[PDB]
Each structure stands twice: as structure tokens, then as C-alpha cells.
Design a protein around this ligand. Sequence first.
Ligand SMILES: CCCC[C@@H](C)[C@@H](OC(=O)C[C@@H](CC(=O)O)C(=O)O)[C@H](C[C@@H](C)C[C@H](O)CCCC[C@@H](O)C[C@H](O)[C@H](C)N)OC(=O)C[C@@H](CC(=O)O)C(=O)O
Ligand SMILES: CCCC[C@@H](C)[C@@H](OC(=O)C[C@@H](CC(=O)O)C(=O)O)[C@H](C[C@@H](C)C[C@H](O)CCCC[C@@H](O)C[C@H](O)[C@H](C)N)OC(=O)C[C@@H](CC(=O)O)C(=O)O
Lengths: 133, 133, 315, 315
Amino acid sequence: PKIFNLFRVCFISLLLIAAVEYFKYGTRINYEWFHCTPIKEPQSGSVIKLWARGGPSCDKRGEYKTIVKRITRDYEPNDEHLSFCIIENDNVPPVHYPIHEDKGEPGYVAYVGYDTDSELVQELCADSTIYHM
Amino acid sequence: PKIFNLFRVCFISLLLIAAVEYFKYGTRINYEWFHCTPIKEPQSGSVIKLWARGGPSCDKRGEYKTIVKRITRDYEPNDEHLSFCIIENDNVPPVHYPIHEDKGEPGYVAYVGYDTDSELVQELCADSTIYHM
Amino acid sequence: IWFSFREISYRHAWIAPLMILIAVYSAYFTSGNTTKTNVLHRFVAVSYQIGDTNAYGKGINDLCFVFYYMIFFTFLREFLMDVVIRPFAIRLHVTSKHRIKRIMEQMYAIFYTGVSGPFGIYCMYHSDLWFFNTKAMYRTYPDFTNPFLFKVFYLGQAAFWAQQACILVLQLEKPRKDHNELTFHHIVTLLLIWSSYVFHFTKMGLPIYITMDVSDFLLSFSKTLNYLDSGLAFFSFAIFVVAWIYLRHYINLKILWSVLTQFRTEGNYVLNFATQQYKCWISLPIVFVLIGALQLVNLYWLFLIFRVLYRILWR
Amino acid sequence: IWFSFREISYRHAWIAPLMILIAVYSAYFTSGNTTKTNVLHRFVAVSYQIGDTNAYGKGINDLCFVFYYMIFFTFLREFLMDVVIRPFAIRLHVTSKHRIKRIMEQMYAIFYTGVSGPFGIYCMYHSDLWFFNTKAMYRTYPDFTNPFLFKVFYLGQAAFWAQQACILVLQLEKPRKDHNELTFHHIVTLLLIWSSYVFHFTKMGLPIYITMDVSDFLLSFSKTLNYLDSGLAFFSFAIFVVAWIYLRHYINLKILWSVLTQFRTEGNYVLNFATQQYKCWISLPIVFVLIGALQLVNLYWLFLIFRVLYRILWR
Ligand SMILES: CCCC[C@@H](C)[C@@H](OC(=O)C[C@@H](CC(=O)O)C(=O)O)[C@H](C[C@@H](C)C[C@H](O)CCCC[C@@H](O)C[C@H](O)[C@H](C)N)OC(=O)C[C@@H](CC(=O)O)C(=O)O
Ligand SMILES: CCCC[C@@H](C)[C@@H](OC(=O)C[C@@H](CC(=O)O)C(=O)O)[C@H](C[C@@H](C)C[C@H](O)CCCC[C@@H](O)C[C@H](O)[C@H](C)N)OC(=O)C[C@@H](CC(=O)O)C(=O)O
């Protein structure tokens, strides 16, 4: 009765079970890293324009998630304080992307920049609310 | 010259090096799980009010990050489409929390709900832009 | 009395698992709440009934259920094996060692396999899969919810084959005989059950053992009638060979072909991690490879069947 | 000629590391860009110079530097040991086996240790830490940037002690003698260097070996003059014991006390993962425990020193 051989086999089986369940959970909660790829559009001195484009699994919240994570971990506010604006495309259904590469207008566009040029963010973000950070 | 003993010792040393560097990186990029704790305030049928409270390391973007992740992974839009609004406290400096427990007004408050009750979100979010999802 | 209890547990092999499961059942059935608000319930029944309908979710209580019924299925095997299959090995004249050991093994195989065959067929009967319908496999794919009989069928198979595989690696006695094919079978069966349940390929899972169980019933019946020399054994073996050729080859080939063609065509085929549906072009390889592994094992086995068939035919 | 090269590498031990590092240096110094845009530069020099100033960042090129200089420090030890310290062991009359082995070891210790002592003192001189100032340790904590001499001092120590520890685990010869205290010393030294550099406790790291290096210089000088019987050995040992008592006890006790008191009081003491500053109440335990480990080792060692001191005093 070699108990330890059993014990190690069962303990590694449970380890695969837990690993695959973590795979499922993780790929669910932050799926936007898989389906959505964030586009950075350069601009004048310190501002950029954000959005995302993917397949039909890149819905509006995939775009919002990826845009806000790009905004919040591409800009260090401890060095200099930033300022951003997010504008939503109000005539495009939430799930709106085609499988192919003629996708069109995104669901969300966001303008983000540092506070050296905050009037530039004022200009690019027309009359939407402007979030400070 | 027992080479393999060396090889395993060096390979586990490099493994600790990589593990601790991942510790540093991970705790940096998503620090808001450590410093910021998100407060849910119940409301009428399907809406809630969001914000965060922590120490001086829970700055405005810690609150924005934790609020948007609560909004985006506490609400499944594939079942029913939601609608949210984020309102910023425009007279409180970005880094504004005391070490002690008399902290006061947060940097950000967000209202989020389902589309059964979207006029309720209209009511709670006074005149700020309302994001669909 | 602890020593005497150990002595009786040495003269039997079912006393301790029987005590474990009878204690669990008695404690659970002591009056109270025989509902989802009890740990023994997560260990005695399928949990996560969605609302109050015939749909069941997944969770860790599934693993608790599986392991408790491994504990149970040890008791079913030891009790049946000794208490029943030794009398049916002695009260009928049989005179050998390998002959009696394998006659016990084959009749226990007959028992559990003829229990699990008709139950699988019934589960497939009152469903849209009737007589191996390859489109109901993929019509509504993500299948987060399984019916009561269907879920319990899946978790009983998991408990049974896990118990087989763990007594395969805890070598009590009988060191080595067929264990290469046996270990490949056990590992592949357990991986397919687990990966079929976890990744929602569940209505895909029912038809494939249905075939394995009813074919194994026929095979074990043929070998039992070989042991108990009757002269009707060759008739049962011909019935077995035609049933094997039908089920394990034609039905599984149809199922593979079903994968290849109607895995794309039917239902949902756009990957979506948020919706948690994995039926895409990335999982078609994995599914086809597992089905192919099962088919390769069955191909080697009918090579063996036909080798024996022709040698006996001219002998 | 490959066999003859192996024979010369068997009659020496520095030929192969010398070839490796001379090839790397020659390839790097072949005309081109002797700047940060070269892999050999990440293997030959400290990288991540911030802007064009005397501040240096961290990265993987640090590990590349450390391992390349492990390769180098193997060549320094083998070349010095053989080519120099065997003539200084033979040209001066010494007649034994353990006597000559340990006389080589102690004079090599004298060499590297008296090289690393004054360099550490110089690094602490042109800094705000002068003569062990316990407040410049914590004034500007996060210290993502280290000066040139200070960073190269930290990475040379890492390469040297890592090479020591790897030839400790690759047992060539001389199986067992003092290896319990030796392995504790090597593991603790390497962990403190790595954890001090990685977690920015870097200006905290300079004063602590300064003490270890200059004290080890004095100790090895005393043991060398013991070997080479001179009669001046006891004078050097008294100087060593007073320097040990001063440095490794008073300065490290002051540094520990500095941790306990001015780790909170001085600089930044609010944990902030975003800013990447770990100087909080969670790291004070770790720092104090490492310093305490070093102090326990030095306490056992002066128990040994004084045991020898009094026995020789009345012998
Ligand atoms: C008229 C009836 C007489 C029965 C006759 C046909 C018998 O062939 C002989 O007539 C005997 C001589 C032939 C001769 O030379 O005269 C020979 O076959 O050995 C038969 C042939 C066999 C090679 C078929 C495979 O076995 C089955 C294993 C398949 C997979 C299954 O396991 C599924 C899975 O695992 C799990 C349970 N779901 O069965 C045996 O022979 C077995 C051996 C066992 C042994 O030796 O291993 C034995 O008979 O007990
Ligand atoms: C007037 C001058 C004569 C020298 C005299 C004091 C000598 O004591 C004796 O006079 C000889 C008899 C005494 C007697 O009985 O008469 C006895 O001490 O053994 C001395 C005592 C010694 C116990 C001190 C520790 O060693 C040092 C190791 C500390 C940590 C260091 O390593 C740092 C670190 O690792 C790294 C390098 N940074 O040194 C030895 O003795 C060593 C033994 C070696 C051995 O046996 O292991 C030997 O002499 O070579």
C-alpha cells in the first residue's frame, strides 16, 4: 500500500483542477485583455486619444475597462497631476463590432493629458465632464 | 563536481528573484486593492452608490480604478444592459485622505444601475454625463 | 474492541467505508434541514439548483460530492465483490486461480456497467439528443446548467472512475497485468470526464459513454460465459462483436465527424471569455484529440478482438 | 589542441574564465557603440543611467552584470590564488598541509577584503552618511537611483558572494570544515545584498559591510601573521579584537537602534504601493531580523575570539 504515491497523484490532480478553475475565473473577470486592444492616438504635447477595437466580445464595457486602465497606469499622477475626459458614442449598440476588420466607430473615446496642457484637454473634450486625477 | 546541485540552487534563486520582482510590479500596478476599499451604498430597486476610502495612498485614481472595476465586474451587461454616472468632488485635492478614520468626503462618487430603472439613475445623477454599457 | 474491529476490517474490506458513509448519512438525516444549508448536503447531493427548476450550476460542492461518492463506491465494490461474487464463483463449479479472480472481476464489471448503461440511455432518451442527435450537442452550447439525472450521471461516473484510478495507484496486491492499456484507459476516461464537465461540453459527454457502458456490458457478459463454460459463449461473443462494431466505431466516428463539421456550423462559434463560452476554433483541436485518443484505444481493442476471433474460428 | 588546452586548464583553473571574459571585453571594445545600445554593455557596465547625471536605475541588466562579474571574480580568485599566493607560501618557509592551505585562503581574504574595505569607506565618505550617520539612511528613503560607485559597489559585492556561494555548492574538493557557519554566513550575506538592493534599502547597506570588510581585513591579517610565525602576531590580534569590538558590535548595535527609532521618525513612513516605498511598519520586522541574524553570528564569533584570547593569555 504505497500511500504516498496516491497522495502525490491526488494532490497534483487537485492542483490541475484549481489551476484550470483559476484560468476560467481570470479569463472571465478581465477578458478585455484578450478581446480588446487599446489604440493610442498621439496628439499635441502631452495628450492622447484612447479607444479599443476587437470582435463582438469587445463590447462597450470592454472598451471602458481597457481605456480606464490605459489612462490610470500609463500616467503617473504623483509626478504630475493629469486630467481626462471620456466621450461615449451614443448611437452604436453596446455589442457592435464585426468579426472582420471593417469595424468602424468605437463605443468610447477618451482624451487624457497632464496638467501642463489642461486647456488642450479642454479643447479636445468639447463639453463633456472633465475628470481630474 | 556535483553540477546539478548547483543548477537547482541557482534556478531556485532566480525563481525567488523573479517572484519578488513580480510582487513589486503587481503591487504597484493594481495597488488600489491594497489601499482602497470600495463602499457600496444600497438604494432603490437596482441602483447603488460607489466610492472608496483609504489612507493617503488612496488618491483620486485609486478611487476611480476601484469604482470602475466594481461597476464593470459587479454588473453583467449580457444579461441586462446597465447605465452609470460618475461625479467628481471638485474641491478636494487629489491626495486628500487622513491616516485616521475621520476621512470625510471622497474624491469620486458613482451611481450605477440596470436599464429597468434608468430614470432612477437620471434622478440620482443630476446633470453629469451618463455612460451606457 | 478496536483490535477486533480491525480484525473484521481485515476479514472484509467494506466495513470502514460502510461506517464512514453510514455515519455521514445518519448525521445528515437526523432531523433538521435536508436542504442546501448543510455541509453534509454538499457531500450527499448535487448542489446549486438554480431557482426552483431542473437546472443545476457548478462549484466546489461538486468536488465534495465526487470525493464522497468515491468513498461510497469503494463500499459498493467491496460489498458486492466479496459478499455476492464469491458465492457466484464457488456455488458454481470453477476450479482455478486466475479463472476465479477474473470471473469475479468480469461479473463485477457486468454489474456496474449494466447499471450505468441503461441509465445513460434513459438520460439521453428524455432529451433532445435522442438516438445520438449530433445537432443538440451544439445547439445551445454554453450549458452552465445540467438536469438532475444528467448531472448526477456525470458526477457518479467521475467518482467511480476516480476510485478505480486511485486503487490503481495504491497497489494493494495483484501487481502487474494489462496495466499499460488499463492506465491509459483510466487516465483518459478521468480527464475526459473532468474536462467535459468543467468546460461545459456536457451533452457531448453523455453519448460517448453510453456507448462505452453498453459495449462493456456485452463484452463482460461474453467473457463471463467464457469462464462459466456453457457453449452459448460464442453466440454472446458474436453479438458483442457486432455491437462493438456498431457502437464504439460507427457512433464515435459519427461523433468525431459531428465535431469536425457541426462544431462550427451549429450554435455559437465566436469566442467570448466574458460570456464564458469556449466553443471556438481553439477548443476543436482539444475535443477532436480526446475523441481520437478514445478511438485509437478502441481500434487496438478490435484488432485484439478480431485476432482472437479468427484464431478461434479455425481452431 | 583542444586536448592540450584542457590539459593547461587542468594545470591551472583560470584559463577558461579568462578566455570567457577576455572574449567578452574584446568583442565589446571592438569599435562601435560603447554605450547603452549593446548587449555586451549590459554585461560589462551598470545600465539605466537616468538622464545624463549620477543616478542609476534598476532592471534585468543588473542580473546580467552580476552574473558576468561572477564569471570575472572566478578568474580573479584563481589567478591571484595560484600565481601569487603559492609563491608567497613557498618563498617563505612554511612546512605543512593545513598550514599552507589556510595560509593561501587567509592571504586571499586579506587581498579582496582590504580592497573592498577602503572602497566602501570612500563611498561612504563623499556622501551624507559620513561616519555612520543614521539619519541619512532614512532621510530620502525610496532611493530608486544610486550613484555610480555606490551601485558598482553593491553589484560587485553581489557577484563576489554569489560566486563564493556557488563554489560552495559545487564541491570541487576540500569536503567539510566550518561549513555550517560558512553556509549561514554566505546565505545571509547574499540574501541581505539582494534584498537590500531590490527593496531600495541601499544607503542602509553601505555602512554594514564597510564594517564587515575592514574587520575581516584585520582578522585575516592577524591569522596570516599567526601562520608566518613572527612574534608580532599578538599585537595584530589585539588591534583586531579592539577593532572588532568597535565596528561589528558598536556600529551594528547603533544601526539596529537606528532602525528601531529613526526608521519611523525619519523620512517617509506611510506605506504606498503606487509610489513604491516599502519603508513602513511591515518591513521594520524584516530589516531588524536580518540585522539581528548578522549580529548573532558576530556574537558567536567573539565568544570564539575571547575563548582563544584567554586560553592563549594564560598559556
Ligand atoms: C466464446 C467467448 C470466449 C471469449 C473470447 C472471445 C476471449 O478470448 C479467448 O477465447 C481466450 C483466449 C483465446 C485463446 O487463445 O484461445 C485469449 O483470448 O486469451 C476474449 C478475447 C479478448 C482478446 C477480447 C479483449 O479481452 C477484451 C478486453 C477489451 C477492453 C475492456 O477491458 C474495457 C475496459 O477495460 C473497462 C472494463 N470498461 O477475452 C479474453 O480472452 C480475455 C482474457 C483476459 C486476459 O487473458 O487478459 C481471458 O480470457 O480472461
Ligand atoms: C596571535 C595571533 C594568533 C591567531 C589566534 C588568535 C588564532 O587562534 C590560535 O592561536 C590558534 C588556535 C589556538 C590554540 O588552540 O592554541 C585555535 O585557535 O585553533 C585565531 C582564533 C580564532 C578562533 C578566531 C576566529 O577564527 C576567526 C574566524 C571569524 C569569522 C571570519 O571567518 C569572517 C568570514 O568568514 C569571511 C572571511 N568574511 O584563529 C584561528 O585559530 C583560526 C584557525 C582556523 C581553524 O582552526 O578553523 C587557525 O588558526 O587556522
